Every structure is written in structure tokens, then in C-alpha cells.
Design a protein around this motif. Structure first.
Motif, PDB file in Angstrom:
ATOM      1  N   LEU A   1       7.581   2.616 -15.304  1.00  0.00           N
ATOM      2  CA  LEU A   1       8.267   2.664 -14.058  1.00  0.00           C
ATOM      3  C   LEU A   1       7.349   2.622 -12.861  1.00  0.00           C
ATOM      4  N   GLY A   2       6.380   3.228 -12.969  1.00  0.00           N
ATOM      5  CA  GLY A   2       5.490   3.423 -12.019  1.00  0.00           C
ATOM      6  C   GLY A   2       4.688   2.012 -11.691  1.00  0.00           C
ATOM      7  N   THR A   3       4.088   1.492 -12.994  1.00  0.00           N
ATOM      8  CA  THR A   3       3.497   0.210 -12.791  1.00  0.00           C
ATOM      9  C   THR A   3       4.273  -0.980 -12.433  1.00  0.00           C
TER      10      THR A   3
ATOM     11  N   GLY B   1       2.261   0.596  -2.341  1.00  0.00           N
ATOM     12  CA  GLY B   1       2.719   0.323  -3.879  1.00  0.00           C
ATOM     13  C   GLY B   1       1.729   1.610  -4.560  1.00  0.00           C
TER      14      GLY B   1
ATOM     15  N   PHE C   1       3.791   5.040  -4.385  1.00  0.00           N
ATOM     16  CA  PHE C   1       4.731   5.316  -5.391  1.00  0.00           C
ATOM     17  C   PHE C   1       4.255   5.288  -6.769  1.00  0.00           C
ATOM     18  N   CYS C   2       3.272   4.516  -7.185  1.00  0.00           N
ATOM     19  CA  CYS C   2       2.808   4.643  -8.444  1.00  0.00           C
ATOM     20  C   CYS C   2       2.353   5.927  -8.640  1.00  0.00           C
TER      21      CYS C   2
ATOM     22  N   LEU D   1       4.928  -0.648  -8.493  1.00  0.00           N
ATOM     23  CA  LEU D   1       3.612  -1.393  -7.648  1.00  0.00           C
ATOM     24  C   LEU D   1       3.568  -2.830  -7.890  1.00  0.00           C
TER      25      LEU D   1
ATOM     26  N   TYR E   1       0.671  16.182 -13.668  1.00  0.00           N
ATOM     27  CA  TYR E   1      -0.750  16.318 -13.953  1.00  0.00           C
ATOM     28  C   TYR E   1      -1.875  16.651 -13.346  1.00  0.00           C
TER      29      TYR E   1
ATOM     30  N   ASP F   1       5.746  10.315 -20.937  1.00  0.00           N
ATOM     31  CA  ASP F   1       4.873   9.560 -20.617  1.00  0.00           C
ATOM     32  C   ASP F   1       5.104   8.158 -20.418  1.00  0.00           C
TER      33      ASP F   1
ATOM     34  N   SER G   1       7.314   7.150 -17.530  1.00  0.00           N
ATOM     35  CA  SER G   1       6.818   7.597 -16.168  1.00  0.00           C
ATOM     36  C   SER G   1       5.940   6.137 -15.855  1.00  0.00           C
ATOM     37  N   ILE G   2       4.886   5.728 -16.889  1.00  0.00           N
ATOM     38  CA  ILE G   2       3.933   5.091 -16.880  1.00  0.00           C
ATOM     39  C   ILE G   2       4.651   3.504 -16.546  1.00  0.00           C
TER      40      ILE G   2
ATOM     41  N   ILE H   1       4.567   9.075  -9.105  1.00  0.00           N
ATOM     42  CA  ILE H   1       5.415   9.719 -10.615  1.00  0.00           C
ATOM     43  C   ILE H   1       4.193   9.677 -11.672  1.00  0.00           C
ATOM     44  N   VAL H   2       3.311   8.997 -11.825  1.00  0.00           N
ATOM     45  CA  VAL H   2       2.472   9.058 -12.817  1.00  0.00           C
ATOM     46  C   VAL H   2       1.637  10.217 -13.102  1.00  0.00           C
TER      47      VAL H   2
END
Ligand SMILES: *[C@@H]1O[C@H](CO)[C@@H](O[C@@H]2O[C@H](CO)[C@@H](O)[C@H](O)[C@H]2NC(C)=O)[C@H](O)[C@H]1NC(C)=O
Ligand SMILES: *[C@@H]1O[C@H](CO)[C@@H](O[C@@H]2O[C@H](CO)[C@@H](O)[C@H](O)[C@H]2NC(C)=O)[C@H](O)[C@H]1NC(C)=O
Ligand SMILES: *[C@@H]1O[C@H](CO)[C@@H](O[C@@H]2O[C@H](CO)[C@@H](O)[C@H](O)[C@H]2NC(C)=O)[C@H](O)[C@H]1NC(C)=O
Ligand SMILES: *[C@@H]1O[C@H](CO)[C@@H](O[C@@H]2O[C@H](CO)[C@@H](O)[C@H](O)[C@H]2NC(C)=O)[C@H](O)[C@H]1NC(C)=O
Ligand code: NA
Lengths: 454, 454, 454, 454
Positions: free
Chosen positions: C317-319, A365, A368-369, C322, A377, C311, C314-315, A372-373
Motif C-alpha cells: 500500500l505504501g509503494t 509521496g 505517505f510511503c 507513492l 520500526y 509486512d 504495509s509495503i 506507514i512502512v
């Protein structure tokens, strides 16, 4: 019958206990100890050989990078690239002019191989017009070679096409003679390097990196190992046949309880009461013997100079020696005080695997989180391989402050991914160090008390 | 007799309890405390002396590298080598021309020693022909020296033979005067450096590294320590003789139970009931005293300038002070609340050694496997020493991400050793952190409960 | 009635047990498994797309730093600054002269955008006189631009005012064409960089750092994803509606016990006996579905080139992925041997939070102390963010020796903050490693025994 | 009397319980919460002020190193030294010629202070002759200054004496004006730097390092904090007086049990039953109040520009805020479920200190051993401070592989100290990680079970 219950009591009793009754002192034990010693000595004497082989290739390849690359100090393999037009031209002409006068500039007997074929690869019809946003690109690749022979304008007047460019490669070969073998009083091993210089322009980013790659192919010019290699194939094959006879006795004495549980009416018990009969270590022994004799035949092919691949022989001998070493533990468990401690592992291995599933779900989990996030950066989160290596390095604690300083420096770019970085990394580290790892401690402890007190 | 059972009750009772009965306040206790204090002060006053001795050699040796080596910035001791022909010539002529004009260029009173003997070593008959693969190499080494005296063509016209070359060495000596001793108001200590510059071409790889080595030999030109050194030999020798008398009483009162267990018919008990009689700390005391007086006699030889070796005196005094320090614990165990906690160690030390065998077998398994397989592709797995240091650094967790990034960057070379690297390192780390280390926690915990509850 | 007690026994029984009674094989289960698989594939196929997008911007931005900055080698983004007057002038004129002849010097199809507006910003009345300590400073900022068009003294004779200076910025834009998309057989994606070069003089310290920043805005020149995106919105929305009906049954069958505990006179029980009725995972499911469909609509906006912000998509889809992954554990707890181990977490989570308060108070104590005291003397203790990251990296043990060597080298400045540094760091490390972390081990262990033995 | 037993029951009962009986809602509680909040806000608003003060000095000092030192790139503060004669001369003349033309070369309003006094210090009679080993050295130091005034041969023809040399120092001062304060709309703060350039030749090793040191003295040229500072002294002093009255009641109600245990004949109990009466947190409160008001009066002296020392005010406010924060825990222990967990610390703190003695003896053993033995051969073992920081960093595991690689590279010098290095570091790491740290786990666990089960 009661006689067939006595057929089991020989096979079920330890090898240590069968000296008092039948008076057969074990040779199968001594074949196991000789198999340990002979495999490990064969591994070491092979590994030292590849140590002196590999450092010769590594030191020559560094010497070629200092000879054929413009302005190269060590520590700059990756971040080394051409950024202007004249820098790429001067890199090419430095490479070939440091090829033509090789024997004065070199520090060895670098001879030529009959030679240097320079080439560039450009697209068939590369039409690009950013002042119109119209184009016509034909993806056929046009190879354009040129030949150079060593002892100007036949090689000069070389014109690139920077509006259509993929690669610029340089092929040549060099033969040298290894000098250490003459000190070792043997037949020498002449090497043949295959130098490849590549100016990659794959992504078309305005940045052309430079790299140099070599490849060798050893061939002889104008024993104790070989006798030891026919020993290590002979003894280990004999252990393969002997313990194959032990599996033969297991599969043939299996039926005389299945017959016996039909006349006693033992209700035809399921998987476990026929699982608990056969063996627990001879599977490990028989795969050790298959793996050993495959690697040693491969080694004879290697050092008889019809070799072509170091990879399979190295990986088979390494895994074989590993399994031979963990075959020592079954001799430790004949003593009582060791048998308690080894029994702790077997009573704890099911529950630790049942917990390993519940760890791996949450761990994937966060993989994969975070990929991408924090991918665009950070720099340790580029691919999912690097994410799993970074997070699993942070489970035990390796490199926390460099990851936090990487998110502290550039502020990500916005405040949102920095505010997400603090919550992501603090929740992950405080989860797996404090709670999950302490469950591993509690599971092994409770398993120890379970095996102890009755 | 019942009288000889009273012979034991004096020796078995603590030194603290023998003030009420016989009224002998202990001096043996005070000799032990003075032996602690005097050894540690002797260690510190010796160690500060070698601190000011070593930093003078280290700072001068860095100053010679900046004087005699062409283009040297710090951080490049290892990766510094000559790669062309003219670079090796200019390195030699820079070294000697920065020798001849020394006193202007230097920043001290560097005087000469009557001087510079340059030499090269080439083979007797080095015949190499990679265009024919025929050769004739005679392994006799021909030394070819040349002499240089300080106040051109006698030194110039020096011709190497790059087709037959082993080493190019340069020997000279320099005498200077240590200036700090005149501030310390004493007799000075003139040093004599022995500078060795070596152009090693041992492996014949096209890469000639450069290194500089010095060596000193101190000799005097035109106390509180010595009185303290005859104190530390005197008191510690007296403790050696006194506790030798205690071992004398042990070996003589041993027989009066062996006689007594024949008249009482105690069946001649085996090893343990004669092991539990003698002592538990005076063996540590007597080897501390032998080690201390050997080091201090060696120290008197050192600082009376007939010295020649810092190594043995340093290692004997260091190990002696270590054992003197762990002799304090036996005074802590006279109290009850400390005696429980020290008894936890003795009840846990057998089982932790029985488990240490089962750890070391699997650990040497991963050592022999990882060295051959990941040897040519990693850089921390070159030799078996570096493999054991790398894996044992990864047990606790030191440098995980650098090892994973080293296998991530170059992709090994093929996909197979990368796919093997992931499985090797993940299985190793997840074995020894989660299960084995938790067994160490469970063993010490169960030993604590065993010593606690009855 | 007794009938309404049977209304509960359907809802309270597991989904696995309801195949024998009613014969409804579960489709809700299969919607959950398809929702796991489709979300993760949607995440990966999106993430690889942004990998090839981000590395093009990163490699071009490095190429602009090598083109437009005077004397730039990699590893010097932060410590790169102008210190004299002529160095700042030569930095400006190098930037513009490496702009005007761009297409020869570049290595791509860098076209212009109709261009370069150089400007400096100085105060309205900057009167400074340190020889009098009298002044008159007007904080109005006077912008002073100048225009440059590409195909001397119109651009030359540029005069700064170093006694009144804030910033010197340079704006221009460049359009290029991504070449990898033509290999991928699709419509290309022309990028438009917005290069900003800034000579910041904000603090007025005698040090003007230099930095370069870009920004892109993609726009098209002259599928399998889109069908998969309408699938992932459709199935996940259907799961949102289906489990909304499950929450509907919970909120409607809640009242038939509250009515029933008034006729049975159940005394109107407080918060917990109405808390233990509703659900434990469908809250996680319903926030997963809201988060998923918000991110996927945002993604359709992204890849239909009306995008403007990577931003939020991405955040979200990531959460979402998870939480979908940690929704697997509730299927593991239908088995018994997993249900014990997951119950250990729930019985340990209250007490570990009650201890987490008592940790965070002392931890914030050492944060506020160490930041003010060791702030001006260390470099990892500059701001309170870096202090919390440094101390929490030292809880597990990351970088101890670099912090100790930083306080060892410069001696702080005085002996007092060095003497305080030793006591601060030794007390902190020895507190949280030995006592607090061992309380975490003891709490999880006692919770395991509590869930085990009855 | 039975009445005086009721005198105790008020003082022994909690502040939470005394709202039902007497109806006095607590203000002493609210003074404690206000004291927490006001101290922390005072700490933060002071710390941000010194952040903007310190970075101005740090950035200017880096700007002076780039102006006045020959060939300086960042990362070379320590390893920067002159090795030849002309390099030391060119370093001096670069420093002064980059002083005389300061305002063109600088990037600020660097004004002069009426200036540059160059000086060298040589011995009175430095007679050194390594060709005779006879000498006459007079340790009197002869200062030889020279004066330079800014707007050749008056400054040129400077002749050093390299056979007698200690230091070459350069003193000058520069006044600048901080520009950020005019943005903050206040009275500015002109700084006065005191630049010291030193060519140290203390050890006389042939290596003269170079370093630059500054020092400021702020003085004003031509509130909300001050009101908040008289608040933080007023409330905290009132808490000092109020809890001094609580200690007054403790010391006066102590006697009425000592009288009472003579009439009841309580046998005049020893230290503990008069220790368990007074307090457990108001000692922490009263030292917090003394420390707070001392720091705040010091702060008023700081920011009223009669300041001279940042050190004492920073360390007193930092330690005061730390103790105020750990005064929160006593409000957490009024709840029951927190009172169990805090009681675990008090029942475990004696036994963990009794074990801390037995750890520190063996730890100081390995410190004194490793410093003398591996001192001249490692680089992290130079002084005993660095040894204790290195070993305690290796307890938890910080930097194992760098210490092992340092002993692996140079082979020490001989095989004996390498063979000793392997045994030293393996025995130390395997002692303190496996056995000692597991005893800390077992002690806290057994203390938890002791406080739990009755
Ligand atoms: C430079 O680019 C060319 C493509 O223009 C590469 O040629 C391809 O190489 C791969 C593997 O080497 C083959 O699978 C392709 O079939 C080749 N394409 C063609 C059209 O022949 C070339 O390999 C690149 N250079 C290097 C050193 O990798
Ligand atoms: C350079 O190489 C020569 C060999 O040609 C080295 O000479 C040998 O040195 C070792 C130890 O120093 C001796 O055991 C051998 O007997 C020597 N061989 C001969 C033929 O004398 C020489 O030492 C090398 N130089 C350095 C600095 O190591
Ligand atoms: C250089 O300094 C000027 C101020 O002199 C900056 O202009 C300010 O910029 C911020 C945000 O960019 C705005 O909030 C202010 O309103 C601006 N002030 C004025 C007077 O316009 C300028 O941004 C700085 N340059 C850079 C690249 O940041
Ligand atoms: C350079 O060396 C001289 C000694 O020749 C130093 O002068 C001594 O300085 C210390 C402290 O600074 C004083 O305690 C001594 O009394 C001084 N000695 C004399 C004879 O005055 C001088 O300080 C050194 N320079 C620097 C920058 O440290
Ligand atoms: Na590190």
C-alpha cells in the motif's frame, strides 16, 4: 485630455525626486523611520519583561518536581513511570507527606491556600475476566474524591481498584511572592500556582506515567512604558490614516484611465494592466498598522493585570515587527545597484513557485510511503508530522547517520524492511540533493542573466 | 615635465621586475619571509606553554569539586542544586569537614594559607507575610561572617534565616607546587588557588544552585625564548620603519600629479583617482607590526611573572599572526594564473556586500519575531544571542531536527504556537537555503565571467 | 494511405484538446482524480489503526522489561549483561519469582496461559583444559528443560555448567485484554504475548547479555471501512481494465506504421522510433493498479483477523500510494510553463546517470579501503553496511566531528593509522564536496540552457 | 623515415580498435578484469576474518573492566578517577581480590599463567615543603615491586607514599580458548591476554585516573584461502611483468622521435612534448601490483601464525584495492559520452589546485588564531589537530550550535573573548560558505563549458 496624463506623473515618480519640483521635503518618510524605531523598542522592552516572568515559573516548577515526586533527577520528564503496585502507593503517600510538612522542607515563603483534594476515577461496572473472555463494562466514570487539610487514617486506608482505573489526580494551590520586584523598586506581583499531579492510566498498558503541571494567575498586592505605549499607538495610527489617503488617491485616479481608454479606445484591457497601477508596499504597511495597534491595546490589557493570555499579544507584536523590518527594502531599491539585485527576486519568484508544486507532490509521496512502512520500526516516523520534519531535515542534511543507525541496529525485524529502508533513504537523499536543489540554483542563475544583459 | 612621469614607473612596477634594470636583489622580500616564519614560531612556542599551564588549573579545579561538593559526578555543573533545608545544611558541613581534614583526604601537597571565612548575607528587615499580603522590606544587606582555623560548637550552631537570604559564600586559599617543572629542569612555579564556594539564592525560586570557582596567582619559589623574543621585536620593528618610508614616498609623490593635473588641467579629479595611487597591502603590514610589538612586550611582562592578564597578550598575538598569514596572497598574485582568481574576489566583493545588507534586514526580522514568540516555549530561543546563533546555524543546516522535536514534544502549550512554529521554521529554511544562497552562487559566477572574457 | 496518418493524430493529441472536436468530456480524467483521493484516504485510515496497535505492544513490552529484568533503567537495552556467576543466578531467580507473584505486582489483568518452561543447553562432551591444551568437544547440543506451574526445591537446586554453556531460555505466555476498544464501542481484541527471555552465551567471551522479546497473536473475544475497501478495489480495477484497452490500441496501431514504412520504404528503423510510439505513464498506472488491489485484498485478510503478517500489506500500500502521487506530474505538464521545467529533468537524466557510474566506482573504492583499515579502530566502520552509511552521511555532511574525535581520542593505537586517518578523511571529504557535487550543479545547469534557448 | 611514424600509430591507438586490423583479441584486458575480481574477493575474505578476531578481544576487554575495576558502568572510560586516599587503596585491593578468586567469579575457562607483580614507582628523594618553599628533588625513579601467587599480610601492609608518587602498575596474564573455531571445524586459536592496570599520577593534579589495557598473542594448540592466495600473487605478478614490457616499449620508442626531431630539426622541445608520450595509467597499475604482492606475502605471514603486526598488511591491501578500483575509469573513457565528462575533471584539476593554495593560507590563518585565543576557554580547541578538525567540520556545517553554545554558556570568562568569539566564528563561516565554495562551483562550471562548446 493631455492634462490627466500629468496626473499620473506625480504619483508614478519616486518620493526622492519630488524635492526639486515642488519643494516638499518628506515627512511621510520620517514617519516611516520613526515607526520602525518605535515598534522595535516596544518589542524589546516587552520581551525582556516576559523573560524575567517566564524563568520564575520555570524554576519554581522544577522545584516542585524535586519536592513532590519520588526519586526525580533531571532529564527524566518523559521516561518516568510506576510499574508495580507498591511503587504507585509510595508515590502518592510521598506526595502528600511532602505537602503537609511544606514550610520546613521548602526554601521560600510558600503559603497555603484554603486544600488538597485527592481523587481517583474508576468505571461504574468494570467486569474483566480473561479466564472466561466474558465481560460487562459500563463506561460511566465514578469520581471518588477525598479531602486533606493541613495545619492519619482519615487520609490513610486509601484503597485503589487496579482492575478498573483511569486517573488519579491531586489538586492544590500555593501562593508565593516575587522578590525581584522589590529590588526593582515597584509594586510586587504575588503569584498563585495551581499544581496538578496526574497518574495517567489511559491506554491501560501496565505502565502509569507521572507528570506535574502548574499554572499561575498574577495579582497585585499592596510610567515610561505607558507613555511610550500611547506614542506607539498614536504614530502608527497616523500612518494608517495617511496611507489610507494614498489608497484613496489610487482608487480615484484608477477611473480616469478607464474613461480615457474608452475615448482612445484602449479595448478594455484585462486584469494585469489594472493590476500594475495601484501599489506594491502600502498593503504591507496597512496590515502592519492594523496588527500593531491590535497588539498594543492587548499589551495595555496585559500589564494592567487584566491579562489572562500571553499568546495573542506575543504573536501579533512579533509578526508586526517582522513586516515593519521587511518594509526597509523598498528604500534600498531607490538606488540603482540595489534595484538590479532586488529585481532578480521578482523575476525568479514565479518560476520557483511553478517548480515548488512539482517538488511538493513527490515530497508528499515519500511522506505517505515512509510513515506507514517505517512507522512501527523506526522512532522518528511515528506520526506524519514527525515524518515531514524528518525528511525535510534530511533535505539539507541534519541527522542522516542516526536514522541509518536506527535501521541498522534492530534489523527492523525482518530482512525485507531493512532492504526497503536502504532503497528508500538512498533514493530520496540522492534525488533531492543532487537534482532538485541544482534546479533551484539554475533557475535563480538564469533569472539573474535575464535581468542583467538587456 | 616628462621626467616626473618616470618617477611613477619605478613605484608602479613590481618588485620582481626590478632585478633586470637596477640590479638590486630584494632584501625587503626576505624581511617579509623572515617576519612570517619568526612570528609563527613565536606563536606556537607561546601556545604550548599555556597548554601545560591551563590543564593544571582545569584538573585541579575538577579535583576540588570532587573534594568539597556533596554527591558530584561529572556532567552536572549546571543542573546541581539544593531543594530542601537539610540538604543545604549538609552541603555546608560537608564542605568544611572536607576542609579541616584536608591532607589525609587529598592526593597532593595541598598546604594551608593563614583561613576559612564562612559568611551569609541577609536583608536588614525582611518582613514577608503571604497570609496578609503586607510587608516591610529594607534592602540593606547585613553581612554576617564567621571564622574557621584549621590545625566544634564554635563552628556549629550555625543558624540560617531562610525567610531572608541572598548568598552563602565560603572563602579559603590553598598553595601547591607544580611538579612538572622539576622534570623540565627549571625554577618551579608555585600556584595559589582562591576557592570560592557559593550557594546562590538570587532569584528566590525555591532552588539554590551550587558552584565552585577558583583563581590562581603564580609566583616563583627558590634564555632561548628571551633571545627569540628580542629577535621578533627587532626584525618586525625594522619592517615597521622600512614600510613607513614607503608610505612617506607615497604621500610625497602624490603632490607631483596634483601639480601636474593643474598644468595639464586635469579638472581636479575626485576621490577615486587619488585613492588608486597609494597602496593596497602596506596598511595591513603596518597594523601587523604595531600589533606584533605590542603583544611581544606584553608577553615579556607575562613570562617575567608580573603578568596578571593572559587575555590581551593572547588576542594581540593571535590577530597579528592571522594578518601576517593573509599577507602571503600578495606574493601569489605576481603570477598571472593566480592573478585572475584573486581578481574574482575583488570584482565580487562590492556586489556581495550590497546583497549582504538585504540579507541582514530579513534575518534580523526573523530574529526579533522568533525570540518573543517562541521564547517561553523553546529552550534555544531564550535570549536574542541564542536566537541569532540558532537561526544562523540553521542557514547551513546544523540542528534542524532537535528544534522541530522540541516544538513537537510539549505541543508548545496550545495549538496556536505549534501551528505558528511550523509556518515560521518552514518559511525561514526554505527562503534562505533555496533562493538567497543561490544568489550568492550566481553573483560569484557572473563576476568570474566578467573577469574572464575580455 | 493518408487516412491511417489520421489514426495517429487522435492518439497523439492531448486529452485537453479533445473537447472541441468530438465533444467527449473526459471521465477517464475523473477516474484518475478519484483514484488519487480514494487510495490516500485508504492509506491514512489504515495507518492510524496500526498506530494504536503498535503503541500497545511497545508500552507493554517496556512494562515486561521493568517487571522481569534485574536492575533495568531505560537506555540500556544493548549494554546490559551479566559478568559474574551470582549475577546470572540472581537474574534467573528474579525472573521466575517476579513471575509467580504476577497479579499483585502487575498493573493490569495479566492472566496466565496453561506454563513457564525454563531450560539450558549444554554441549554433549565439553572437555576444555587450558592447563594442558588438550580437549575433546562433541558439538551435539543437549537440551535440559524444567517445568514451572503457578498457583521451592522442585524449582530450586538448579545447577548450571559454566564450562559448557550456550543458551538459557525462558518461555511463557500471557493473555490480556485491550481496553481502548471498549471506549471505541466495538468488539474487543484480546492479545496473547509470547515472552522470551534469553541469556545468550554464543561467542563465549566472558560476557552474557540479557534481552527480552515478545510476540502477539490477536484473536477476537465475545462497516465504513469495508464499504470503502470494496470501493477502492472496484474503481482501481476499472482503471486497470480501461488503460489495458489503451495499451491494446497502442499494440494494434503499431503495425500500421510498420506496414506503412515498407510501402513508403522507411528502411525498417531501429529500437528508438518504435520506442517513441507507445506510452510514457500508463506503465506506471498499470503497476499502480496491480499493486493496489494486491494490498487491499491483503488488508481484508488482515482486519478479518486471519492476518499473520503486517509486512507485505504495509509495503504494497505504501509503494502504491507513492506511484499514484507521482502520477500527478503528467497533468502539470499539459501547461507550457511547467512543461519546460519538467523537460529539464528528462534532458538531464541520461548525463546524470552516466556520471553516477563514475561516482559509484570511486565511492566503492573508499568503502573497501576504509572498512578493512579503520575497522578495528573506529566504531562506525564495523561492517560494510555501516561504512557505506557513514561515508554517504559524510557526503552532504552529517557527523564529521564525531568521526574525527573518535580517531583523535584513542590515537587509534599507533601513529600510522592516525596519520592514515587524517589523509583518508580529508581527501575523501574534499573530493566529493568540492568537485563531484559541483559537476552535478553544472550538468543540471547546462541541461537547463539547452532546453531553454532554441 | 615515414615508417617510424607508423611505429607510433599502433601504440597510440586504443585496445578496442586493434581487433579489426591485426585480429588479436585482448587477453591483457581479461587479466585486468580478473585482477579486479580476485583482489576484491581476497580483501573481503581477509576482512571478515579480522572481524571475528577483533570482536573477541573487544568483548573480553570489556569483561575484564567489569571484573577488575571498582564501580564501573559503561560510558566512563575517560572520566573515571580516584580522588581520595581510601578510594585508591580500595581500588587496588578490589583488583587483587577479584584476581585471586577468579574461576568462580568468571564466566569462562580463564586459566592462570605462572604471576601478579604489583609495583609502585616513587622518586629517590622527594622533599616537598610548601610551608617553606624549599625542596630537594632527585629525579631518579625507585621501582618497588611485590609478588603475588594464586592457589594475607604478605600481600597486605602495602604502604604508598603519596608525597612522592608517579605510577602504580599491575601486570598479569590470562590464557583462554576461543570456542567459535570448534564450531567452524578447524584447529583452535588459544589467546593469551596481557592485562595492564595503571593508576597514572603523571601531572600531579590531585586526580589519579584509572585505565585497563590488554594485549594478545595468538598461538595454535593441538586450504581454499591458501590456493586463492597463490593465485592472487601469481596473476598480479604476471600483470606486473607484462606492463613492465609496455613501459619498456615506451622508453625505447621515445628515442626514435628525438632522433627524428633532429633531422626534421624540431628544435629540441621542452618537458611537455616528451611528457605527453609515455603513459597515463600504467604507473597506477605498476604501483598497484607492487603494493598487492607485498600485502599478500605479509598476509601469508599473518595467517601462518608468525604474525606480530596487523597494521601493515591491512593498510597495504586496503590501498591496493582502492587503486585497482579507480583503474576502472580508464575503461569508461573509451566511450565518447563518458570521455567528455572525464575530460571535465582534467581541465578543472589545475585551476582547482591553484585555488587550493589560496584557500589553505587563510585556513591556516584561522587555525593559528583560534587555537591560542579560544584554547583555554573552549574544549574543541585544545590542540591544533582538534582546531583543524573543528574548523573543517564547520566548512560544510556539522556542529555549529554546540560550538556557539559552548561559548554562550560560561561567557568565556570575560566579555572580551565572548565578543571576539562572535566576530571570529561569524566571519569564518560567512567567508568560506558563501564566497569560496561558490568559486569552486564557478570553476567546475567554466571548465565544463570550455570542454563542451568547441
Ligand atoms: C482522567 O480521566 C477522566 C475520564 O475518566 C478525565 O475526565 C474527562 O476529562 C476531559 C477533559 O479533561 C473531559 O472532556 C471529559 O468530559 C471528562 N470525562 C468525565 C467523565 O468527566 C480526566 O480529565 C482525566 N484526568 C486528566 C488530568 O486529564
Ligand atoms: C551575594 O549577594 C550579595 C548581595 O546581597 C552580593 O554583594 C554585591 O556584589 C556585587 C558584585 O559582587 C557588588 O557590586 C555589590 O555592591 C554587592 N552588594 C553589597 C551590598 O555589598 C554578593 O556579591 C553575592 N555573592 C556573590 C558570590 O556574587
Ligand atoms: C541457543 O543455542 C541453541 C544452540 O545450542 C540454539 O538452537 C539452534 O537454534 C537455531 C535457530 O533458533 C536452529 O537453526 C538450530 O537448529 C538450533 N540448534 C539445535 C541443536 O537445536 C537456540 O536457538 C539458541 N537460543 C536462542 C534464543 O536463539
Ligand atoms: C610510570 O612512570 C614511570 C616513570 O617513573 C614510567 O617509566 C618510564 O617509562 C617510559 C616508557 O614506558 C620509559 O621511556 C622510561 O625510561 C621509563 N622510566 C624509567 C625511570 O624507567 C612508566 O612507564 C610509567 N608507567 C606506565 C604504565 O606508563
Ligand atoms: Na548532530
Amino acid at each position: 485630455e493631455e492634462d490627466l496624463r500629468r496626473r499620473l506623473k506625480y504619483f508614478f515618480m519616486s518620493p526622492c525626486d519630488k524635492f526639486r519640483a515642488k519643494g516638499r521635503k518628506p515627512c511621510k518618510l520620517m514617519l516611516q523611520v520613526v515607526k520602525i524605531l518605535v515598534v522595535t523598542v516596544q518589542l524589546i522592552l516587552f520581551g525582556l519583561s516576559n523573560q524575567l516572568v517566564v524563568t520564575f515559573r520555570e524554576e519554581n516548577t522544577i522545584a516542585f518536581r524535586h519536592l513532590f515526586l519520588l526519586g526525580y533527577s533531571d532529564g527524566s520528564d518523559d521516561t518516568f513511570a510506576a510499574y508495580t503496585q507498591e511503587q504507585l502507593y509510595q508515590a502518592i503517600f510521598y506526595a502528600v507527606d511532602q505537602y503537609l510538612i511544606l514550610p520546613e522542607i521548602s526554601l521560600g515563603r510558600y503559603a497555603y491556600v484554603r486544600a488538597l483534594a485527592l481523587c481517583q476515577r474508576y468505571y461504574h461496572r468494570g467486569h474483566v475476566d480473561p479466564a472466561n473472555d466474558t465481560f460487562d463494562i459500563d463506561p460511566r466514570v465514578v469520581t471518588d474524591c477525598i479531602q486533606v487539610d493541613p495545619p492519619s487514617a482519615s487520609y490513610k486506608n486509601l484503597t485503589l481498584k487496579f482492575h478498573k482505573l483511569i486517573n488519579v489526580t491531586i489538586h492544590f494551590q500555593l501562593k508565593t511572592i516575587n522578590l525581584q520586584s522589590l529590588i526593582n523598586n515597584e509594586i510586587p506581583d504575588c503569584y498563585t500556582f495551581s499544581i496538578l499531579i496526574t497518574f495517567d492510566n489511559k491506554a491501560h498498558s501496565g505502565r502509569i506515567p507521572i507528570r506535574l503541571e502548574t499554572k499561575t494567575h498574577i495579582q497585585e498586592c499592596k510610567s515610561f512604558r505607558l507613555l511610550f505605549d500611547v506614542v506607539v499607538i498614536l504614530t502608527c495610527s497616523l500612518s494608517f490614516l495617511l496611507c489610507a489617503r494614498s489608497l484613496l488617491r489610487g482608487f480615484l485616479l484608477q477611473n480616469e484611465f478607464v474613461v480615457f481608454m474608452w475615448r482612445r479606445r484602449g479595448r478594455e484591457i484585462s486584469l494585469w494592466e489594472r493590476l500594475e497601477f495601484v501599489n506594491g508596499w502600502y498593503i504591507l504597511l496597512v496590515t502592519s498598522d492594523v496588527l500593531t495597534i491590535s497588539g498594543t491595546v492587548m499589551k495595555i490589557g496585559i500589564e494592567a493585570k487584566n491579562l489572562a493570555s500571553y499568546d495573542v499579544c506575543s504573536i501579533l507584536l512579533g509578526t508586526s515587527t517582522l513586516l515593519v523590518w521587511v518594509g526597509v527594502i523598498r528604500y534600498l531599491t531607490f538606488f540603482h545597484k540595489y534595484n538590479i539585485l532586488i529585481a532578480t527576486l521578482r523575476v525568479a519568484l514565479p518560476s520557483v513557485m511553478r517548480f515548488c508544486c512539482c517538488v511538493a507532490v513527490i515530497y508528499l509521496g515519500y511522506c505517505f510511503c515512509g510513515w506507514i512502512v517505517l512507522g512501527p520500526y523506526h522512532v522518528k516516523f511515528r506520526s506524519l508530522s514527525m515524518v515531514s520534519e524528518c525528511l525535510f531535515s534530511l533535505i539539507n542534511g541534519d541527522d542522516m547517520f542516526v536514522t541509518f543507525a536506527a535501521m541498522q541496529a534492530q534489523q527492523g525485524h525482518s530482512s525485507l524492511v531493512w532492504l526497503f529502508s536502504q532503497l528508500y533513504l538512498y533514493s530520496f537523499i540522492s534525488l533531492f540533493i543532487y537534482m532538485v536543489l541544482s534546479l533551484f540554483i539554475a533557475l535563480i542563475t538564469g533569472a539573474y542573466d535575464t535581468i542583467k544583459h538587456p
